[PDB]
Amino acid sequence: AKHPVPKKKTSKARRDARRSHHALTPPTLVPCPECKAMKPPHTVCPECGYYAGRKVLEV
Amino acid sequence: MKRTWQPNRRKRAKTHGFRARMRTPGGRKVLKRRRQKGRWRLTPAVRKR
Amino acid sequence: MEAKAIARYVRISPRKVRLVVDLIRGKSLEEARNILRYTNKRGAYFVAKVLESAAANAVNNHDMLEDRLYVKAAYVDEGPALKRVLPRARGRADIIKKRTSHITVILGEKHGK
Amino acid sequence: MRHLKSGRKLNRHSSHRLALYRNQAKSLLTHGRITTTVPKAKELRGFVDHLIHLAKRGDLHARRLVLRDLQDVKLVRKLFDEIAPRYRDRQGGYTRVLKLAERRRGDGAPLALVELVE
RNA sequence: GACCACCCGGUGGAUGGGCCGGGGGUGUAAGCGCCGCGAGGCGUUGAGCCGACCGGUCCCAAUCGUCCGAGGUCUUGACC
RNA sequence: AGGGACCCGGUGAAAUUGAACUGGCCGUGAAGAUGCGGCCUACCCGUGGCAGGACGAAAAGACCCCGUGGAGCUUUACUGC
RNA sequence: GGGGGAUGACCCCAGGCGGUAGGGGAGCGUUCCCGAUGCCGAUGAAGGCCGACCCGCGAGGGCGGCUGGAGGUAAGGGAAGUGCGAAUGCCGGCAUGAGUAACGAUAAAGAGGGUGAGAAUCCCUCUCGCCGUAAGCCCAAGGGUUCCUACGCAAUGGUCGUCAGCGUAGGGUUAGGCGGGACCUAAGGUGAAGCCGAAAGGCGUAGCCGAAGGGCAGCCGGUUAAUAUUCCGGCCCUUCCC
RNA sequence: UGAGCUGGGGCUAGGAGUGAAAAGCUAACCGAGCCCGGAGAUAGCUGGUUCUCCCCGAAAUGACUUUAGGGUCAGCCUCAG
RNA sequence: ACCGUGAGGGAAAGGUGAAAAGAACCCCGGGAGGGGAGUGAAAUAGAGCCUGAAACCGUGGGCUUACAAGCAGUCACGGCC
RNA sequence: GGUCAAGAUGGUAAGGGCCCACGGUGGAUGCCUCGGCACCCGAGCCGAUGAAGGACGUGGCUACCUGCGAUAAGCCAGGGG
Ligand SMILES: [Mg+2]
Ligand SMILES: [Mg+2]
Ligand SMILES: [Mg+2]
Ligand SMILES: [Mg+2]
Ligand SMILES: [Mg+2]
Ligand SMILES: [Mg+2]
Ligand SMILES: [Mg+2]
Ligand SMILES: [Mg+2]
Ligand SMILES: [Mg+2]
Ligand SMILES: [Mg+2]
Ligand SMILES: [Mg+2]
Ligand SMILES: [Mg+2]
Ligand SMILES: [Mg+2]
Ligand SMILES: [Mg+2]
Ligand SMILES: [Mg+2]
Ligand SMILES: [Mg+2]
Ligand SMILES: [Mg+2]
Ligand SMILES: [Mg+2]
Ligand SMILES: [Mg+2]
Ligand SMILES: [Mg+2]
Ligand SMILES: [Mg+2]
Ligand SMILES: [Mg+2]
Ligand SMILES: [Mg+2]
Ligand SMILES: [Mg+2]
Ligand SMILES: [Mg+2]
Ligand SMILES: [Mg+2]
Ligand SMILES: [Mg+2]
Ligand SMILES: [Mg+2]
Ligand SMILES: [Mg+2]
Ligand SMILES: [Mg+2]
Ligand SMILES: [Mg+2]
Ligand SMILES: [Mg+2]
Ligand SMILES: [Mg+2]
Ligand SMILES: [Mg+2]
Ligand SMILES: [Mg+2]
Ligand SMILES: [Mg+2]
Ligand SMILES: [Mg+2]
Ligand SMILES: [Mg+2]
Ligand SMILES: [Mg+2]
Ligand SMILES: [Mg+2]
Ligand SMILES: [Mg+2]
Ligand SMILES: [Mg+2]
Ligand SMILES: [Mg+2]
Ligand SMILES: [Mg+2]
Ligand SMILES: [Mg+2]
Ligand SMILES: [Mg+2]
Ligand SMILES: [Mg+2]
Ligand SMILES: [Mg+2]
Ligand SMILES: [Mg+2]
Ligand SMILES: [Mg+2]
Ligand SMILES: [Mg+2]
Ligand SMILES: [Mg+2]
Ligand SMILES: [Mg+2]
Ligand SMILES: [Mg+2]
Ligand SMILES: [Mg+2]
Ligand SMILES: [Mg+2]
Ligand SMILES: [Mg+2]
Ligand SMILES: [Mg+2]
Ligand SMILES: [Mg+2]
Ligand SMILES: [Mg+2]
Ligand SMILES: [Mg+2]
Ligand SMILES: [Mg+2]
Ligand SMILES: [Mg+2]
Ligand SMILES: [Mg+2]
Ligand SMILES: [Mg+2]
Ligand SMILES: [Mg+2]
Ligand SMILES: [Mg+2]
Ligand SMILES: [Mg+2]
Ligand SMILES: [Mg+2]
Ligand SMILES: [Mg+2]
Ligand SMILES: [Mg+2]
Ligand SMILES: [Mg+2]
Ligand SMILES: [Mg+2]
Ligand SMILES: [Mg+2]
Ligand SMILES: [Mg+2]
Ligand SMILES: [Mg+2]
Ligand SMILES: [Mg+2]
Ligand SMILES: [Mg+2]
Ligand SMILES: [Mg+2]
Ligand SMILES: [Mg+2]
Ligand SMILES: [Mg+2]
Ligand SMILES: [Mg+2]
Ligand SMILES: [Mg+2]
Ligand SMILES: [Mg+2]
Ligand SMILES: [Mg+2]
Ligand SMILES: [Mg+2]
Ligand SMILES: [Mg+2]
Ligand SMILES: [Mg+2]
Ligand SMILES: [Mg+2]
Ligand SMILES: [Mg+2]
Ligand SMILES: [Mg+2]
Ligand SMILES: [Mg+2]
Ligand SMILES: [Mg+2]
Ligand SMILES: [Mg+2]
Ligand SMILES: [Mg+2]
Ligand SMILES: [Mg+2]
Ligand SMILES: [Mg+2]
Ligand SMILES: [Mg+2]
Ligand SMILES: [Mg+2]
Ligand SMILES: [Mg+2]
Ligand SMILES: [Mg+2]
Ligand SMILES: [Mg+2]
Ligand SMILES: [Mg+2]
Ligand SMILES: [Mg+2]
Ligand SMILES: [Mg+2]
Ligand SMILES: [Mg+2]
Ligand SMILES: [Mg+2]
Ligand SMILES: [Mg+2]
Ligand SMILES: [Mg+2]
Ligand SMILES: [Mg+2]
Ligand SMILES: [Mg+2]
Ligand SMILES: [Mg+2]
Ligand SMILES: [Mg+2]
Ligand SMILES: [Mg+2]
Ligand SMILES: [Mg+2]
Ligand SMILES: [Mg+2]
Ligand SMILES: [Mg+2]
Ligand SMILES: [Mg+2]
Ligand SMILES: [Mg+2]
Ligand SMILES: [Mg+2]
Ligand SMILES: [Mg+2]
Ligand SMILES: [Mg+2]
Ligand SMILES: [Mg+2]
Ligand SMILES: [Mg+2]
Ligand SMILES: [Mg+2]
Ligand SMILES: [Mg+2]
Ligand SMILES: [Mg+2]
Ligand SMILES: [Mg+2]
Ligand SMILES: [Mg+2]
Ligand SMILES: [Mg+2]
Ligand SMILES: [Mg+2]
Ligand SMILES: [Mg+2]
Ligand SMILES: [Mg+2]
Ligand SMILES: [Mg+2]
Ligand SMILES: [Mg+2]
Ligand SMILES: [Mg+2]
Ligand SMILES: [Mg+2]
Ligand SMILES: [Mg+2]
Ligand SMILES: [Mg+2]
Ligand SMILES: [Mg+2]
Ligand SMILES: [Mg+2]
Ligand SMILES: [Mg+2]
Ligand SMILES: [Mg+2]
Ligand SMILES: [Mg+2]
Numbered sequence: 007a008k009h010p011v012p013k014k015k016t017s018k019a020r021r022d023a024r025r026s027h028h029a030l031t032p033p034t035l036v037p038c039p040e041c042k043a044m045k046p047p048h049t050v051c052p053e054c055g056y057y058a059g060r061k062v063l064e065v
Numbered sequence: 066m067k068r069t070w071q072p073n074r075r076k077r078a079k080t081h082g083f084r085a086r087m088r089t090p091g092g093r094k095v096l097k098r099r100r101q102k103g104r105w106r107l108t109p110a111v112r113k114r
Numbered sequence: 115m116e117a118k119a120i121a122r123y124v125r126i127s128p129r130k131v132r133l134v135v136d137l138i139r140g141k142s143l144e145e146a147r148n149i150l151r152y153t154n155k156r157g158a159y160f161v162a163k164v165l166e167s168a169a170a171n172a173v174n175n176h177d178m179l180e181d182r183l184y185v186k187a188a189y190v191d192e193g194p195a196l197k198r199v200l201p202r203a204r205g206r207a208d209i210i211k212k213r214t215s216h217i218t219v220i221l222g223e224k225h226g227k
Numbered sequence: 228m229r230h231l232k233s234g235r236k237l238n239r240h241s242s243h244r245l246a247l248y249r250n251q252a253k254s255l256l257t258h259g260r261i262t263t264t265v266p267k268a269k270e271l272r273g274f275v276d277h278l279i280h281l282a283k284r285g286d287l288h289a290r291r292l293v294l295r296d297l298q299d300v301k302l303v304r305k306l307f308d309e310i311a312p313r314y315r316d317r318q319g320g321y322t323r324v325l326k327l328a329e330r331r332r333g334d335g336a337p338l339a340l341v342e343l344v345e
Numbered sequence: 346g347a348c349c350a351c352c353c354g355g356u357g358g359a360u361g362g363g364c365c366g367g368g369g370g371u372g373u374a375a376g377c378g379c380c381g382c383g384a385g386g387c388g389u390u391g392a393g394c395c396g397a398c399c400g401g402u403c404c405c406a407a408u409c410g411u412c413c414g415a416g417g418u419c420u421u422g423a424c425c
Numbered sequence: 426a427g428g429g430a431c432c433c434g435g436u437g438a439a440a441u442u443g444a445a446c447u448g449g450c451c452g453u454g455a456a457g458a459u460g461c462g463g464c465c466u467a468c469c470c471g472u473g474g475c476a477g478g479a480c481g482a483a484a485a486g487a488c489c490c491c492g493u494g495g496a497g498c499u500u501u502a503c504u505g506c
Numbered sequence: 507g508g509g510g511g512a513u514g515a516c517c518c519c520a521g522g523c524g525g526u527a528g529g530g531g532a533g534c535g536u537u538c539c540c541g542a543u544g545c546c547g548a549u550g551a552a553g554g555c556c557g558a559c560c561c562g563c564g565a566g567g568g569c570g571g572c573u574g575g576a577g578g579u580a581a582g583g584g585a586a587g588u589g590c591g592a593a594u595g596c597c598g599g600c601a602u603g604a605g606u607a608a609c610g611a612u613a614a615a616g617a618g619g620g621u622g623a624g625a626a627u628c629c630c631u632c633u634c635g636c637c638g639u640a641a642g643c644c645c646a647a648g649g650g651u652u653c654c655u656a657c658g659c660a661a662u663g664g665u666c667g668u669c670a671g672c673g674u675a676g677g678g679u680u681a682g683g684c685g686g687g688a689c690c691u692a693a694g695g696u697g698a699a700g701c702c703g704a705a706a707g708g709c710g711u712a713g714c715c716g717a718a719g720g721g722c723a724g725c726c727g728g729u730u731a732a733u734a735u736u737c738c739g740g741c742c743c744u745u746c747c748c
Numbered sequence: 749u750g751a752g753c754u755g756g757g758g759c760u761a762g763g764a765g766u767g768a769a770a771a772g773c774u775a776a777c778c779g780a781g782c783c784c785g786g787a788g789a790u791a792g793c794u795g796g797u798u799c800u801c802c803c804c805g806a807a808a809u810g811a812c813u814u815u816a817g818g819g820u821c822a823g824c825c826u827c828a829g
Numbered sequence: 830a831c832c833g834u835g836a837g838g839g840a841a842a843g844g845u846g847a848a849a850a851g852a853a854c855c856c857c858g859g860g861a862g863g864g865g866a867g868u869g870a871a872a873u874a875g876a877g878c879c880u881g882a883a884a885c886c887g888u889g890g891g892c893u894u895a896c897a898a899g900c901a902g903u904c905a906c907g908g909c910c
Numbered sequence: 911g912g913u914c915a916a917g918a919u920g921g922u923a924a925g926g927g928c929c930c931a932c933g934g935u936g937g938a939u940g941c942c943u944c945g946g947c948a949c950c951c952g953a954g955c956c957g958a959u960g961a962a963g964g965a966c967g968u969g970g971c972u973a974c975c976u977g978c979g980a981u982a983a984g985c986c987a988g989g990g991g
Contacts, residue, residue, distance in 0.1 A: 007440035011482040015442040015602045018886095019926055026470050026925040028605085030137050033152040036410045044148045047410065049328035050340060056408090059325055060260070060342065069775040070834065072648055075757090081835055090706055095836060098784095100963060107963085109835080112650080122862050123877085125660085127437085128886075128934090129605075139888095152328070154335055156435065159624085163858065170857035171864040189888045191934035194877070195600090200438060200664080205776095208438050210664090216934065217862095218888090228346095233397045240427060243614055246634045253633060254617040261617070269362075272405075276363050288375050288393085298633090319364035320404030333666040334626050335434025344405065 077111045115176045116186055118220035119167035124160055127213035128192045131157035135188050135217065142184050143169055143221070164219045171221075178223050186222035190215045235270045248274045249296045256297075256306055261341040268324045268339040279321045282311035313345060320344060 035044045038051040045051035054061035079085065086092035086108060099107045124131070134157040138146040143165070150162045165185070172178035193214030200208045239247060251271050255261045256278075263271070278296065281289045285307065293303055314321050325340035 011441040012603050032149050046328050049326045052328050120863055167857040174856045175865045192886050210438055231397050250616045250633045272362055
């Protein structure tokens with residue numbers, strides 16, 4: 007409001023191009039060891055999906 | 066910091082009250098105008114019975 | 115056949131949720147689900163609901179077989195604006211607008227043999 | 228810049244950071260399983276390991292030591308008698324940190340699992 | 346090193362955390378014994394405690410995995 | 426050292442804004458040019474930063490003058506009370 | 507301008523035709539009136555959306571398709587709230603900056619369990635921190651259901667909410683002794699008498715009004731989700747009438 | 749401990765009050781409060797002034813002007829006769 | 830309504846359809862919302878409801894663009910649809 | 911079948927631009943109106959028998975409006991229908 011301020015309205019072409027880097031990257035996902043579903047790597051696969059580790063059960 | 070509005074019900078009726086308005090001919094017109102504008106309240110509503 | 119579900123007047127900014135919608139466009143339903151579950155956005159929840167409501171319209175209303183439907187089309191349009199006052203320094207009052215989206219997932223069966 | 232200097236600051240000052248760990252240690256060594264933020268975990272390993280490895284020593288010094296951070300007369304008991312044994316032949320690695328695939332919401336924080344090994 | 350990028354590792358692995366050893370800092374821990382009415386003092390005692398630095402060691406954690414990615418436009422020129 | 430600044434999730438303003446596809450030099454031009462001439466340089470789009478320029482924003486210059494504009498004050502200005 | 511006598515509107519002919527302030531002359535379109543007891547219209551009015559078509563120098567007029575769903579209005583004349591791009595114009599709508607600053611004290615948080623479609627944010631437990639002449643408690647102002655409980659989460663809450671001072675509903679405020687009034691007077695106000703002023707009105711002795719001052723009889727416990735010196739229990743007083 | 753501070757109840761105001769005096773204060777702007785009215789005050793000043801085509805097409809000088817960035821007459825444009 | 834102690838200031842906000850026939854029931858969903866069914870001459874007349882313009886924001890398609898430089902148009906040729 | 915020096919040319923869009931189609935937003939345009947405006951008639955006072963204007967109440971369930979007043983969506987009588 008005070009000291010600086012924009013001098014001209016930015017074109018639709020110019021905000022849209024600023025946003026050319028705003029796209030998301032879809033999650034990284036692997037199929038679980040033995041349980042059915044898809045899970046993110048290096049994590050406790052939400053349907054119990056660990057052997058030598060615990061799992062907090064879905065069971 | 067202490068502001069302009071420091072409510073005090075006695076003061077409010079002592080000052081803009083109906084009986085106060087009726088004393089002064091100046092006040093009798095205030096009623097007359099408000100009553101003719103069709104104001105729903107002729108006078109600041111005050112309470113604390 | 116193709117089937118669609120529309121969540122309207124969803125109290126979220128179009129530009130915000132549009133971001134995850136673009137994440138499922140053209141994809142299998144199977145994949146799309148797996149994407150929304152782990153997409154870390156408030157818009158996931160909503161888009162999830164619209165998608166699942168769309169499938170539940172293909173199978174029960176249009177006969178489409180859940181195992182063959184992809185996200186043929188999807189988009190979100192700008193619902194009406196919730197103008198609210200934001201009190202500011204030196205007695206200003208701005209108006210922030212809580213935005214609103216119209217989510218439209220539209221499903222079709224994959225052209226598989 | 229500030230290279231090395233091992234030791235996360237967890238947007239806390241000195242005293243808060245201490246009582247963070249302590250209050251997280253008690254909480255661990257009472258349920259033996261903990262869910263926290265991934266970083267609050269990573270940093271919580273060594274703090275407890277040192278505590279256990281000290282209760283393997285059995286001596287009252289080791290006890291009197293530990294008491295500084297856990298302050299409670301039991302638990303230390305439960306530490307020395309019920310937990311400290313199980314690691315006798317186990318040198319280091321008394322603790323395990325597993326990552327949960329679920330995040331919070333209205334926060335978005337990645338979470339992790341902290342439990343006692345074996 | 347702001348995020349990104351860059352670099353090293355990812356079990357056929359010493360990458361970090363732990364544990365051990367060394368360095369380093371602090372400067373004689375608790376407990377017990379002796380002397381003193383006592384505050385304290387002495388011995389055990391360079392003890393005890395110990396962040397990063399130098400290393401060691403699979404005890405814990407880098408499991409298991411998915412995804413992208415060429416088959417090579419044309420003419421000529423010399424050689425097959 | 427801590428609270429911000431940076432990254433992630435949630436919420437999400439503001440002045441400003443002719444339109445923009447908005448470079449440097451030497452000239453030129455209403456005399457201080459991204460926008461005209463000549464030359465030089467320069468793939469497209471961002472993020473964190475600095476503040477030289479857009480005669481940057483703000484406030485229809487408070488100084489100055491103009492107006493047979495206005496107001497406060499003065500006196501042996503005029504004329505009243 | 508001159509002929510063409512065509513007096514028409516028509517032809518050849520020759521000239522003029524940059525243009526601000528301004529002068530003049532022709533027209534286009536908008537609303538309303540006569541034309542209207544008419545005509546167009548559900549086989550689709552007005553308005554909208556296209557058009558590479560037709561006529562007009564242009565302002566415009568047609569025509570065709572889609573939309574639309576009940577009006578419209580010729581030739582020809584009449585009358586005007588009659589054409590917008592600017593007035594830091596007015597009202598409204600929507601952009602830009604921008605996913606940027608910010609999310610309101612640096613007293614500070616951690617885990618476990620519970621509810622729930624959904625929990626960093628609600629409930630309980632343990633741990634940790636902050637006030638402690640307060641950041642605790644009780645009165646007076648002021649506010650006026652915000653109190654207690656049940657059911658709720660669209661909005662309000664600077665995030666989230668299953669919570670709330672929010673939404674719906676139901677309940678809850680008990681006095682001869684506490685405060686105020688059927689008592690007193692203070693400044694001041696009002697004001698028979700009285701005095702003054704063009705009118706409105708201004709003064710003014712007593713009187714009257716006027717209080718957080720004078721005067722006046724209740725202490726300790728118990729109970730309700732929500733009231734208690736108010737209800738209850740025990741001890742104790744006041745005034746009025748007979 | 750004082751020309752102290754403070755609650756409650758009161759009085760004084762617009763050319764008027766109040767002021768240990770700054771033209772300070774009199775409801776967040778006081779060299780003369782606020783509201784409504786006279787009022788559409790006045791503004792020789794700034795800004796704005798909306799469809800089309802056709803012809804002609806200027807002045808920025810003179811004289812007077814409490815006049816000089818405004819006017820009256822003449823000059824120069826235009827229309828009818 | 831709201832603003833103002835007060836005098837006083839002072840708004841915005843009309844239209845489903847001939848008729849509620851205002852969408853039983855089923856599916857997704859905690860709800861909102863939608864998809865079917867159904868009503869209707871018409872449901873982009875479904876109650877944030879006649880007509881529904883513009884700014885503005887999206888989805889899809891044709892042409893185009895990463896060694897060029899500019900009041901963004903125009904005049905040429907050329908490719909592609 | 912390839913290799914090879916020189917040279918010559920495609921596709922590719924992170925994103926952007928123009929066009930087209932369909933929506934979202936928004937509520938202009940058209941039509942509608944029993945609200946307003948204007949003139950012309952008519953008509954013209956009410957109040958201590960307590961006016962005007964109100965406060966509070968009043969319904970089997972009633973937030974507001976309207977009506978009414980503890981006889982309270984109303985009581986009695988005449989006339990209309
Ligand atoms: Mg500055
Ligand atoms: Mg674009
Ligand atoms: Mg004070
Ligand atoms: Mg105020
Ligand atoms: Mg009082
Ligand atoms: Mg009178
Ligand atoms: Mg009323
Ligand atoms: Mg303020
Ligand atoms: Mg932070
Ligand atoms: Mg401290
Ligand atoms: Mg890193
Ligand atoms: Mg690697
Ligand atoms: Mg591997
Ligand atoms: Mg290592
Ligand atoms: Mg050592
Ligand atoms: Mg010693
Ligand atoms: Mg010792
Ligand atoms: Mg002794
Ligand atoms: Mg720092
Ligand atoms: Mg953010
Ligand atoms: Mg020059
Ligand atoms: Mg220059
Ligand atoms: Mg140019
Ligand atoms: Mg040029
Ligand atoms: Mg240049
Ligand atoms: Mg040139
Ligand atoms: Mg750039
Ligand atoms: Mg930058
Ligand atoms: Mg600068
Ligand atoms: Mg700066
Ligand atoms: Mg000026
Ligand atoms: Mg002057
Ligand atoms: Mg003057
Ligand atoms: Mg003729
Ligand atoms: Mg000619
Ligand atoms: Mg010429
Ligand atoms: Mg001309
Ligand atoms: Mg003429
Ligand atoms: Mg006309
Ligand atoms: Mg007619
Ligand atoms: Mg029909
Ligand atoms: Mg039609
Ligand atoms: Mg009409
Ligand atoms: Mg036309
Ligand atoms: Mg039409
Ligand atoms: Mg007509
Ligand atoms: Mg006509
Ligand atoms: Mg007009
Ligand atoms: Mg006109
Ligand atoms: Mg103009
Ligand atoms: Mg404008
Ligand atoms: Mg400007
Ligand atoms: Mg609106
Ligand atoms: Mg910025
Ligand atoms: Mg920033
Ligand atoms: Mg920030
Ligand atoms: Mg806060
Ligand atoms: Mg804070
Ligand atoms: Mg739980
Ligand atoms: Mg449960
Ligand atoms: Mg919890
Ligand atoms: Mg917690
Ligand atoms: Mg908190
Ligand atoms: Mg009270
Ligand atoms: Mg309430
Ligand atoms: Mg409550
Ligand atoms: Mg509740
Ligand atoms: Mg809510
Ligand atoms: Mg919220
Ligand atoms: Mg707030
Ligand atoms: Mg919520
Ligand atoms: Mg409530
Ligand atoms: Mg009693
Ligand atoms: Mg009391
Ligand atoms: Mg009393
Ligand atoms: Mg009395
Ligand atoms: Mg009595
Ligand atoms: Mg008295
Ligand atoms: Mg008097
Ligand atoms: Mg009198
Ligand atoms: Mg008199
Ligand atoms: Mg008293
Ligand atoms: Mg008293
Ligand atoms: Mg008493
Ligand atoms: Mg007593
Ligand atoms: Mg209570
Ligand atoms: Mg009691
Ligand atoms: Mg009693
Ligand atoms: Mg004194
Ligand atoms: Mg006082
Ligand atoms: Mg007072
Ligand atoms: Mg005055
Ligand atoms: Mg006056
Ligand atoms: Mg004075
Ligand atoms: Mg003073
Ligand atoms: Mg003031
Ligand atoms: Mg006048
Ligand atoms: Mg004016
Ligand atoms: Mg004047
Ligand atoms: Mg004027
Ligand atoms: Mg002419
Ligand atoms: Mg000429
Ligand atoms: Mg003169
Ligand atoms: Mg002159
Ligand atoms: Mg002048
Ligand atoms: Mg003249
Ligand atoms: Mg002449
Ligand atoms: Mg002539
Ligand atoms: Mg107010
Ligand atoms: Mg008020
Ligand atoms: Mg208005
Ligand atoms: Mg409407
Ligand atoms: Mg109708
Ligand atoms: Mg109707
Ligand atoms: Mg279900
Ligand atoms: Mg729920
Ligand atoms: Mg439906
Ligand atoms: Mg039908
Ligand atoms: Mg239709
Ligand atoms: Mg039709
Ligand atoms: Mg439908
Ligand atoms: Mg249908
Ligand atoms: Mg339609
Ligand atoms: Mg329709
Ligand atoms: Mg609408
Ligand atoms: Mg409609
Ligand atoms: Mg209709
Ligand atoms: Mg519509
Ligand atoms: Mg549109
Ligand atoms: Mg596109
Ligand atoms: Mg080059
Ligand atoms: Mg190129
Ligand atoms: Mg450029
Ligand atoms: Mg160009
Ligand atoms: Mg492209
Ligand atoms: Mg549309
Ligand atoms: Mg009428
Ligand atoms: Mg009487
Ligand atoms: Mg009498
Ligand atoms: Mg009455
Ligand atoms: Mg009523
Ligand atoms: Mg009757
Ligand atoms: Mg009868
Ligand atoms: Mg009869």
